[PDB]
Design an enzyme around this catalytic site. Structure first.
Site, PDB file in Angstrom:
ATOM      1  N   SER B 150      44.101  68.189  28.518  1.00  0.00           N
ATOM      2  CA  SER B 150      42.751  67.830  28.094  1.00  0.00           C
ATOM      3  C   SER B 150      42.018  67.014  29.178  1.00  0.00           C
ATOM      4  O   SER B 150      42.549  66.027  29.682  1.00  0.00           O
ATOM      5  CB  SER B 150      42.803  67.084  26.751  1.00  0.00           C
ATOM      6  OG  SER B 150      41.497  66.678  26.333  1.00  0.00           O
ATOM      7  N   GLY B 151      40.821  67.459  29.557  1.00  0.00           N
ATOM      8  CA  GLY B 151      40.037  66.793  30.589  1.00  0.00           C
ATOM      9  C   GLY B 151      40.325  67.198  32.021  1.00  0.00           C
ATOM     10  O   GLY B 151      39.699  66.669  32.947  1.00  0.00           O
ATOM     11  N   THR B 155      37.669  74.383  31.163  1.00  0.00           N
ATOM     12  CA  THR B 155      36.406  74.905  30.650  1.00  0.00           C
ATOM     13  C   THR B 155      35.371  75.058  31.752  1.00  0.00           C
ATOM     14  O   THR B 155      34.729  76.097  31.852  1.00  0.00           O
ATOM     15  CB  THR B 155      35.887  74.045  29.467  1.00  0.00           C
ATOM     16  OG1 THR B 155      36.712  74.298  28.322  1.00  0.00           O
ATOM     17  CG2 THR B 155      34.434  74.357  29.103  1.00  0.00           C
ATOM     18  N   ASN B 197      38.540  63.377  26.813  1.00  0.00           N
ATOM     19  CA  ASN B 197      37.463  64.261  27.254  1.00  0.00           C
ATOM     20  C   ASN B 197      36.251  64.161  26.316  1.00  0.00           C
ATOM     21  O   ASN B 197      36.358  64.413  25.103  1.00  0.00           O
ATOM     22  CB  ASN B 197      37.993  65.709  27.329  1.00  0.00           C
ATOM     23  CG  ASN B 197      37.029  66.689  27.996  1.00  0.00           C
ATOM     24  OD1 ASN B 197      35.957  66.341  28.483  1.00  0.00           O
ATOM     25  ND2 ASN B 197      37.426  67.937  28.011  1.00  0.00           N
ATOM     26  N   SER B 200      35.654  67.913  24.789  1.00  0.00           N
ATOM     27  CA  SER B 200      36.970  68.528  24.592  1.00  0.00           C
ATOM     28  C   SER B 200      36.890  69.786  23.749  1.00  0.00           C
ATOM     29  O   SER B 200      36.221  69.787  22.718  1.00  0.00           O
ATOM     30  CB  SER B 200      37.922  67.534  23.920  1.00  0.00           C
ATOM     31  OG  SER B 200      39.202  68.106  23.629  1.00  0.00           O
ATOM     32  N   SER B 201      37.597  70.840  24.187  1.00  0.00           N
ATOM     33  CA  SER B 201      37.716  72.091  23.448  1.00  0.00           C
ATOM     34  C   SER B 201      38.751  71.893  22.356  1.00  0.00           C
ATOM     35  O   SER B 201      39.924  71.616  22.645  1.00  0.00           O
ATOM     36  CB  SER B 201      38.167  73.248  24.362  1.00  0.00           C
ATOM     37  OG  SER B 201      37.371  73.374  25.538  1.00  0.00           O
ATOM     38  N   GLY B 392      47.390  73.041  27.893  1.00  0.00           N
ATOM     39  CA  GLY B 392      48.788  73.085  28.320  1.00  0.00           C
ATOM     40  C   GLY B 392      49.670  72.086  27.587  1.00  0.00           C
ATOM     41  O   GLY B 392      49.235  71.467  26.608  1.00  0.00           O
ATOM     42  N   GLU B 394      51.357  68.608  26.972  1.00  0.00           N
ATOM     43  CA  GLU B 394      50.763  67.288  27.139  1.00  0.00           C
ATOM     44  C   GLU B 394      51.533  66.246  26.326  1.00  0.00           C
ATOM     45  O   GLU B 394      52.105  66.565  25.286  1.00  0.00           O
ATOM     46  CB  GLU B 394      49.300  67.344  26.686  1.00  0.00           C
ATOM     47  CG  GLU B 394      48.408  66.250  27.211  1.00  0.00           C
ATOM     48  CD  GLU B 394      46.928  66.507  26.909  1.00  0.00           C
ATOM     49  OE1 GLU B 394      46.546  67.678  26.662  1.00  0.00           O
ATOM     50  OE2 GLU B 394      46.142  65.536  26.934  1.00  0.00           O
TER      51      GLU B 394
HETATM   52  N1  LIG Z   1      34.872  71.181  39.136  1.00  0.00           N
HETATM   53  C1  LIG Z   1      34.232  70.179  38.480  1.00  0.00           C
HETATM   54  N2  LIG Z   1      33.091  69.641  38.972  1.00  0.00           N
HETATM   55  C2  LIG Z   1      32.451  68.648  38.326  1.00  0.00           C
HETATM   56  N3  LIG Z   1      32.892  68.124  37.162  1.00  0.00           N
HETATM   57  C3  LIG Z   1      34.026  68.562  36.562  1.00  0.00           C
HETATM   58  C4  LIG Z   1      34.773  69.646  37.201  1.00  0.00           C
HETATM   59  N4  LIG Z   1      35.836  69.902  36.401  1.00  0.00           N
HETATM   60  C5  LIG Z   1      35.768  69.060  35.339  1.00  0.00           C
HETATM   61  N5  LIG Z   1      34.687  68.262  35.432  1.00  0.00           N
HETATM   62  C6  LIG Z   1      34.298  67.185  34.475  1.00  0.00           C
HETATM   63  O1  LIG Z   1      35.370  66.796  33.603  1.00  0.00           O
HETATM   64  C7  LIG Z   1      35.032  67.020  32.241  1.00  0.00           C
HETATM   65  C8  LIG Z   1      36.235  67.633  31.521  1.00  0.00           C
HETATM   66  O2  LIG Z   1      36.457  68.949  32.019  1.00  0.00           O
HETATM   67  P1  LIG Z   1      36.787  70.199  31.073  1.00  0.00           P
HETATM   68  O3  LIG Z   1      36.493  71.404  31.921  1.00  0.00           O
HETATM   69  O4  LIG Z   1      36.088  70.058  29.735  1.00  0.00           O
HETATM   70  O5  LIG Z   1      38.368  70.010  30.873  1.00  0.00           O
HETATM   71  P2  LIG Z   1      39.313  70.779  29.826  1.00  0.00           P
HETATM   72  O6  LIG Z   1      38.604  72.021  29.338  1.00  0.00           O
HETATM   73  O7  LIG Z   1      40.533  71.068  30.660  1.00  0.00           O
HETATM   74  O8  LIG Z   1      39.573  69.762  28.740  1.00  0.00           O
HETATM   75  C9  LIG Z   1      33.801  67.924  32.282  1.00  0.00           C
HETATM   76  O9  LIG Z   1      32.904  67.721  31.178  1.00  0.00           O
HETATM   77  C10 LIG Z   1      33.135  67.590  33.592  1.00  0.00           C
HETATM   78  O10 LIG Z   1      32.368  66.395  33.441  1.00  0.00           O
HETATM   79  F1  BEF Z   2      41.557  70.689  26.996  1.00  0.00           F
HETATM   80 BE1  BEF Z   2      39.885  70.203  27.056  1.00  0.00          BE
HETATM   81  F2  BEF Z   2      39.566  68.597  26.458  1.00  0.00           F
HETATM   82  F3  BEF Z   2      38.688  71.439  26.728  1.00  0.00           F
HETATM   83 MG   LIG Z   3      37.858  72.872  27.517  1.00  0.00          MG
END
Ligand SMILES: Nc1ncnc2c1ncn2[C@@H]1O[C@H](COP(=O)(O)OP(=O)(O)O)[C@@H](O)[C@H]1O
Ligand code: BEF
Ligand SMILES: [Mg+2]
Ligand SMILES: [Ca+2]
Ligand SMILES: [Ca+2]
Ligand SMILES: [Ca+2]
Ligand SMILES: [Ca+2]
Lengths: 141, 732
Positions: B150-151, B155, B197, B200-201, B392, B394
């Site tokens: 997460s984070g 996404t 996050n 967060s998804s 993944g 965690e």
């Molecule tokens: N390549 C990137 N460039 C800029 N900001 C990013 C990038 N990847 C992640 N972030 C930041 O981190 C936050 C969490 O990323 P996210 O893609 O939602 O993670 P996950 O889907 O793995 O939980 C996003 O809202 C964004 O602010």
């Molecule tokens: F796994 Be993330 F907070 F979309």
């Molecule tokens: Mg996500």
């Protein structure tokens, strides 16, 4: 083709496959043929591709390249003609300036000394030019 | 004598020196602290790269590829805003938590079109391009599997892929906009502010872009998994409910607010910064009226959202029941009876209200996803490119049913990952002329079977419990322990090394030895959480609604675990029919801050994401590899300009002729040089030795070199002539 002959064509193939992944297309095939004084049309190239392009994507590996090459008096007629690709003015000798023209057409980078060096090493009689028999001897080394 | 990498509690690894060698462990002195001393197991100590200042674009260009040099290289690049690095065909992406200047621009998108991996800097765009190119040439569907915690950035990178493919190989045109607006709309309903996050998804997704024979875009399809139900009613101290509730309250018109009786979030039990709820509502409305949602359907969605809110305000108030029954089209007195009678106790009436809330909201999320699928539909297609975006492995201090489901998912995904990496490495060896690659991984099918096997798996054992007259969390846990008493992957919590886990009784939990480590599950609420069927009295109530929309959301036991097993198996069916690329996303710290690399945390993720198993699969007989092009780029500065003027291929044959390197230690391949263990390090040191000795080694190979340059152009002119005749020979 013998073992020696196949190894020499592989190195030649690298002038076609400049990016070095082992793969040819029609773009590569055309570029190199023109750069040696030949103008094949789009359809002629595509028509020849089909022979060994089983999967219709337009790509070719080295061993397929060899069979695309395969077809009694014809052998020597081809080595004579290869010599005349180098000997542009047809006076029977390959000059430094003529080698450089061929060299640089094929994208090779080297100095004018390095061109002279290639002449000198191929020059058995020592006349500063490369005749047909010296050309053949070098090809066969 | 050379410094090595050895463990460090917060950095992962530190530079030190081996000062003593024992049977099981080595004694290490840190460079930083003379007189300080510590022990490390021999398998926890690694060779270091001689140059600690450099970075490589592909970790395969390291003298030693191991977890420690990987971590260091990724760190060096990160400090310089290079968040992307390769491990062969695998992409690692480190979240920068800020906007880097050129990296994602439409101009940058263009510069990656058509290029092979390694001809441009590492980038998510290069992975997306390879997917399209392989689809077009190999006539095969493609998948890009993006993982991380997460984070970490799954996404965002998924969205980068979708933008890249759409701007590069899209239609015109109009399906394109819809494909990139699909994700942002699902996020209103499926994403939530979490401690890890802000966006967060709370569901998994697979997003397919479909193509025809001509490989033009013809449509899209979105699959969704494992929507988090508990979050609808209660949430943790520092967390929010789904974005939609907060966006609706913040940015609705006086008109909508009036019809829906909407107030500030503090007025709703189910809801009680850098979070622009007001602006996000505007963007959501833009995206809604662009995938072709009219104001009528838009308000149908808002009504259901609002009805769930007012349902939450019923404590066991009068005005809450009124507003709720109006928006969900129910009789006020029918809702009252169903929420209060089997008479029901205080806790039991709280459960009935929460169950209806969750079932209505869940069914609404299903409707949204299906509605997004109806905006880019297709009769038929030849291929797809799919991006998988799911959480993944965690760490959690409490592991319940939600964790159990996602961990199970990741076992099957990691199995796919192992299979595909093995296949690439085997394919590489034979193609390059190296013969058989003897590398292997340890399969995790036994852990997969423990969970998913018919009749005897934990999932089927759980379903059996749900069907009993008196279902019990503890009866379920004993049944598992009884059936799998001597399974290698299962244990009882009191065997743990952690005292907190040992206080968990046998019928209150179990340990599973997952790919990434042991997880202790507490099984309380497993039985409840495995059934998402609404009680018949609540099911009838909502089915006979006066609203057509509410009736169509629904147009006794339903296994959550087996529903997901079915979905996962279909996803794997798809994935197994594709060519796969893998993006491993990394979260650098726990603070959402930039330029802050936490080594031990990152190292732990590199392990949970399968990158350690991957590296073992890349320690074949020749654990080092570099292409002629990269060796050329790396080492030409050390040779005479004569040699530097070749021709990366001939350059390399020249180099290995002049250095006279053994045909056993150094294997010249079709496109690469392969090095035995330690030999790339030896080569590197030779290249950096006396420049003059090196010049003399070239000189001695001069004659052979000239002849080779001659033969290359002579045989090439023959080739052209032979090809010219073939055109004639076939013409006559
Ligand atoms: N390549 C990137 N460039 C800029 N900001 C990013 C990038 N990847 C992640 N972030 C930041 O981190 C936050 C969490 O990323 P996210 O893609 O939602 O993670 P996950 O889907 O793995 O939980 C996003 O809202 C964004 O602010
Ligand atoms: F796994 Be993330 F907070 F979309
Ligand atoms: Mg996500
Ligand atoms: Ca090529
Ligand atoms: Ca082919
Ligand atoms: Ca001449
Ligand atoms: Ca001569």
């Amino acid at each position: 083709l013998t073992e020696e002959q196949i190894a020499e064509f592989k190195e030649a193939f690298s002038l076609f496959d400049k990016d070095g992944d082992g793969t040819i297309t029609t773009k590569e095939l055309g570029t190199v043929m023109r750069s040696l004084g030949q103008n094949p049309t789009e359809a002629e190239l595509q028509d020849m591709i089909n022979e060994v392009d089983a999967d219709g994507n337009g790509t070719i590996d080295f061993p397929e390249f060899l069979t695309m090459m395969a077809r009694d008096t014809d052998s020597e007629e081809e080595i004579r003609e290869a010599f005349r690709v180098f000997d542009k003015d047809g006076n029977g000798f390959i000059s430094a300036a003529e080698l450089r023209h061929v060299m640089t057409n094929l994208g090779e980078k080297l100095t004018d000394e390095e061109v002279d060096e290639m002449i000198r090493e191929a020059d058995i009689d020592g006349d500063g030019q490369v005749n047909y028999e010296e050309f053949v001897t070098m090809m066969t080394s | 004598g050379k410094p090595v990498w050895a463990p460090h509690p917060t950095d992962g690894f530190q530079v030190g020196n081996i000062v003593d060698i024992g049977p099981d462990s080595l004694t290490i002195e840190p460079l930083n602290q003379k007189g300080k001393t510590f022990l490390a197991l021999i398998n926890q100590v690694f060779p270091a790269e001689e140059d600690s200042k450099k970075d490589v674009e592909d970790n395969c260009s390291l003298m030693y590829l191991n977890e420690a040099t990987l971590l260091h290289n990724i760190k060096v690049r990160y400090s310089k805003d290079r968040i992307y690095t390769y491990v062969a065909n695998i992409l690692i992406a480190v979240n920068p938590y800020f906007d880097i200047p050129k990296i994602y621009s439409s101009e940058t998108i263009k510069s990656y079109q058509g290029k092979s991996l390694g001809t441009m800097p590492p980038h998510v765009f290069a992975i997306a391009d390879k997917a399209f190119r392989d689809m077009k040439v190999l006539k095969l569907s493609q998948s890009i599997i993006v993982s991380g915690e997460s984070g970490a950035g799954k996404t965002e990178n998924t969205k980068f892929v979708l933008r890249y493919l759409t701007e590069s190989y899209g239609t015109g045109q109009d399906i394109d906009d819809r494909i990139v607006e699909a994700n942002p709309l699902l996020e209103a309903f499926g994403n939530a502010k979490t401690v890890r996050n802000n966006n967060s998804s709370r569901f998994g997704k697979f997003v397919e872009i479909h193509f025809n024979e001509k490989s033009s875009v013809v449509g899209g399809f979105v699959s969704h998994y494992l929507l988090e139900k508990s979050r609808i009613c209660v949430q943790g101290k520092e967390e929010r409910n789904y974005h939609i509730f907060y966006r609706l309250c913040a940015g609705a018109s006086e008109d909508i607010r009036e019809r829906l009786h909407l107030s500030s979030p503090d007025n709703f039990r189910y809801l009680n910064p850098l979070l622009d709820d007001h602006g996000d509502f505007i963007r959501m409305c833009t995206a809604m009226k662009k995938i072709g949602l009219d104001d009528e359907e838009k308000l149908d969605l808002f009504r259901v959202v609002a009805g769930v809110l007012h349902l939450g305000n019923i404590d066991f108030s009068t005005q809450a029941l009124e507003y709720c029954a109006e928006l969900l089209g129910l009789d006020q007195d029918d809702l009252r009876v169903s929420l209060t009678t089997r008479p029901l106790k205080v806790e039991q009436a709280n459960n009935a209200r929460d169950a209806l809330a969750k079932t209505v909201y869940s069914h609404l999320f299903d409707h949204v996803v299906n509605r997004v699928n109806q905006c880019f539909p297709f009769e038929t297609s030849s291929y797809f490119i799919g991006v998988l975006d799911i959480a993944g492995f965690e760490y959690f201090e409490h592991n319940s049913f939600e964790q159990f489901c996602i961990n199970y998912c990741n076992e099957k995904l990691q199995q796919f990952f192992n299979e595909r990496i093995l296949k690439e490495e085997q394919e590489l060896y034979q193609k390059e002329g190296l013969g058989v690659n003897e590398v292997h991984y340890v399969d995790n099918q036994d852990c997969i079977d423990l969970i998913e096997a018919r009749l005897v798996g934990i999932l089927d054992i759980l379903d059996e419990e749900n069907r009993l007259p008196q279902p019990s969390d503890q009866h379920f846990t004993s049944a598992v322990h009884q059936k799998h008493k001597d399974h290698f992957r299962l244990s009882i919590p009191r065997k743990s090394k952690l005292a907190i886990h040992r206080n968990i009784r046998d019928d209150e939990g179990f340990i599973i030895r997952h790919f990434a480590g042991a997880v202790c599950y507490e099984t309380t609420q497993f039985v409840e959480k495995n059934n998402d069927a609404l009680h018949m009295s609540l099911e009838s109530l909502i089915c006979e609604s006066r609203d057509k929309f509410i009736r169509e959301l629904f147009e006794s036991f339903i296994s959550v675990g087996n529903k997901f097993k079915t979905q996962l198996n279909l996803l794997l069916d798809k994935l197994r029919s594709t060519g796969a690329s893998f993006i491993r996303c990394i979260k650098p710290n726990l603070k959402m801050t930039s330029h802050h690399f936490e080594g031990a945390q990152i190292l732990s993720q590199l392990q949970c994401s399968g990158m350690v198993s991957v590296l073992d699969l890349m320690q074949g007989g020749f654990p080092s590899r570099a292409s002629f092009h990269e060796l050329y780029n790396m080492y030409k500065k050390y040779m005479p300009d004569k040699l530097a003027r070749l021709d990366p291929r001939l350059f390399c044959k020249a180099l290995f002729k002049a250095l006279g390197l053994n045909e056993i230690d150094y294997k010249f391949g079709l496109t690469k040089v392969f090095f035995r263990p330690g030999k790339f390090a030896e080569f590197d040191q030779i290249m950096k030795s006396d420049p003059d000795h090196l010049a003399e080694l070239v000189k001695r190979v001069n004659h052979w070199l000239i002849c080779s340059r001659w033969k290359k152009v002579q045989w090439c002119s023959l080739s052209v002539i032979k090809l010219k005749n073939k055109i004639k020979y076939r013409a006559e």
